[PDB]
UniProtKB/Swiss-Prot annotation, chain A:
It comes from the Bacteria. One of its GO terms (biological process) is translation. Keywords: Ribonucleoprotein, Ribosomal protein. InterPro entries: Ribosomal_bL36, Ribosomal_bL36_sp. One of its GO terms (molecular function) is structural constituent of ribosome. This is Large ribosomal subunit protein bL36. Belongs to the bacterial ribosomal protein bL36 family. GO terms for cellular component: cytoplasm; ribonucleoprotein complex; ribosome.
UniProtKB/Swiss-Prot annotation, chain B:
The lineage of its organism: Bacteria, Thermotogati, Deinococcota, Deinococci, Thermales. GO terms for biological process: negative regulation of translation; translation. Part of the 50S ribosomal subunit. Keywords: Ribonucleoprotein, Ribosomal protein. The gene is rplM. This is Large ribosomal subunit protein uL13.
From Swiss-Prot, chain C:
NCBIfam families: L3_bact. This is Large ribosomal subunit protein uL3. It comes from the Bacteria. Pfam families: Ribosomal_L3 (PF00297). One of its GO terms (biological process) is translation. Keywords: Ribonucleoprotein, Ribosomal protein, RNA-binding, rRNA-binding. PROSITE patterns: RIBOSOMAL_L3. One of the primary rRNA binding proteins, it binds directly near the 3'-end of the 23S rRNA, where it nucleates assembly of the 50S subunit.
UniProtKB/Swiss-Prot annotation, chain D:
One of its GO terms (cellular component) is cytosolic large ribosomal subunit. The keyword Ribonucleoprotein applies. This is Large ribosomal subunit protein uL6. It comes from Thermus thermophilus (strain ATCC BAA-163 / DSM 7039 / HB27). This protein binds to the 23S rRNA, and is important in its secondary structure. It is located near the subunit interface in the base of the L7/L12 stalk, and near the tRNA binding site of the peptidyltransferase center.
Amino acid sequence: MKVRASVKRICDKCKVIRRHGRVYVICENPKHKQRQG
Amino acid sequence: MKTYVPKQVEPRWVLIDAEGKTLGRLATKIATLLRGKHRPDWTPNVAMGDFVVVVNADKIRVTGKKLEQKIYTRYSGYPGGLKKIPLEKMLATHPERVLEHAVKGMLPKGPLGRRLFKRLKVYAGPDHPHQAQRPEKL
Amino acid sequence: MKGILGVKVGMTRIFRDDRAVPVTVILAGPCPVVQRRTPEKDGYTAVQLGFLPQNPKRVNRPLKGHFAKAGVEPVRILREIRDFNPEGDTVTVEIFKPGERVDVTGTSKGRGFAGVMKRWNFAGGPDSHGAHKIHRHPGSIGNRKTPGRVYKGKKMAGHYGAERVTVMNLEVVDVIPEENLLLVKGAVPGPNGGLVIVRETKKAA
Amino acid sequence: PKGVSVEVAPGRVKVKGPKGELEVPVSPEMRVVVEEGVVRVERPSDERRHKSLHGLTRTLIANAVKGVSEGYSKELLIKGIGYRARLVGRALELTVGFSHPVVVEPPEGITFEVPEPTRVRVSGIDKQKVGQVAANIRAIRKPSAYHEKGIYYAGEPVRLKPGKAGA
RNA sequence: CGGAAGGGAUAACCGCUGAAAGCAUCUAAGCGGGAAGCCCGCCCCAAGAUGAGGCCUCCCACGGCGUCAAGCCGGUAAGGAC
RNA sequence: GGGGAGGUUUGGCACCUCGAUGUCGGCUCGUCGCAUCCUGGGGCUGAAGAAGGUCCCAAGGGUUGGGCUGUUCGCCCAUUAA
RNA sequence: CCGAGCGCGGGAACAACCGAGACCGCCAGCUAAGGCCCCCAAGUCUGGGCUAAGUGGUAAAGGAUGUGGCGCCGCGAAGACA
């Protein structure tokens, strides 16, 4: 993952948080660290 | 008959606030006055529209994200000579500029169209050169 | 940030320390301080500085023998040190002690209209194989159809002489009040015996 | 809000406490009043931005009060090995994985205080600028570095394979 | 010898107090860090910056037509030039 | 297996130009673009560290010398943070 | 439709998109298209809905706890969401 147009909530422990304008998908493991870009 | 043409009238001066005001909207009014469109005997090729001393332009209001968004640009004939400045920095350093830029573009382009720009003095104060009359407006 | 005026002389390499040092010398000498300049009636903080005395009939009129302290003008007239508020009297040389580094401004000598190689610097080329026609020549300038113009300031042949420069970070290891001299790391722009101001350097302040 | 000292100003509710005062200015929107003895706050309407402001702000000042009512509970647990935290005079001279001693200085409005070298204590009299300095030191020497070693609030370290996982 | 050192605002991103949505959040209110990059700090030009600015001084009336209105003409003062 | 973008390659069209629009590369001179080779920074890592793999921001300045081929291409040699 | 209407007004500028067939004059009036804060002529008219990106001010499959409104099905004062 990490930066891609298709951001998922994958392992349910991840959230969509529209921070600083654009979408990220935060969790515990920074391996799930998507982003709407 | 034959339409009447004004004699050499005496230019009337005027004073305007600024602060709390909207940039465009403000100038919007300024211009129509730099010319005789407010006066009943407006004439195209003459220049008889009131002089306009504007005070504390350092505190003009601007909507949206202009403050951070709006970007003015200047181009020196030089390669990569494009220089663009944000409305944010225009206030800090010599802000009386913003109001002027805003108006200049809102006046004719011809010779007198700059001649009327001269009729406008703007100060980041208030305070002006208390030359004469200068009836404050709203 | 202080300063002193000066005229150029000397250049050698004096075996100071044990190593060799290219020694540019300058006569700061009796260089007057005649008038300051304060914020409201000026807009900064500067001082006017004269030089070498020979001035009688050929000068006259306002002098600034007026000013408020006469002293007559030099002959090499006066210049201006910003951010410098002295003590009063005409300042000599010892303003700078040996062991400090400094900035220095002065006119460069004149090489006039030169050939682009010896100007900015291009290349030329075809001394043989090609043609003899374009030896010391710029070759090309702009692009074909668009822009279709000649770039603003795209380096071109012309003048490269009667100018002026300020050099930074030179090092003075001597100064003789006894005849008013200043012995620095040799790098001195301009010819031997002309206009040159010294000011304090800049590094981290 | 018992022995407090709130103060309604236009959009800047100033409040004194047993330690010092704090000004906490917020948007005039909604209504900022000291009534009966305890402080209240109420949205102008059911408008998204407004609702948000109402909650956010009401709690902001709610802490602002309890901030001068001493809200300091913030201290860093430095774990690892050769990591000593000293406090000479005013400055704190801790010595982490860095090749040099770490030198911090208690600024205006808050105080640190280092009991023993294994754990720094910080009496913070400003809940906002407080966690900022907690994070200052935590991010001065970040912990957990694969296996361990660093500066922990107390946040249970997540591991990752040590002398392995690098082919 | 020059790059600099330092200042200011920031990206990506890293953070603090904190809601709406009793928990959570690096944010929608607010504050911090954070780039050879942006503005400056440096060198040079440069007031035809038609807006021709500022400073230090220096010289000065009626001499003949314009009485009242701006010119115009001949030598001079600081001087400038050949 | 779907959707887009870019206008460098390779083409489909035949509107400026058949009373003229001199087609390859190299010398010289560049300038801009960023989907960045290098140099900053950061997030991820099947990342101990070392070094690497990948993505995101970032053109400031830099992008070397020769063998061969007319050859841009490319292969090679000696190197380079590149 | 132009060409033959490079005559006219819109279309920022444009033979043929929209309006509309110029005998000639006029310092007269309705109006088309298009328009009315200012260029440039006329409402910063009236009234009420939406949006926070400068979207407006030129892009899709596709992606989302963006904001407004609407519909469905449990849970809940027997006491729920958290």
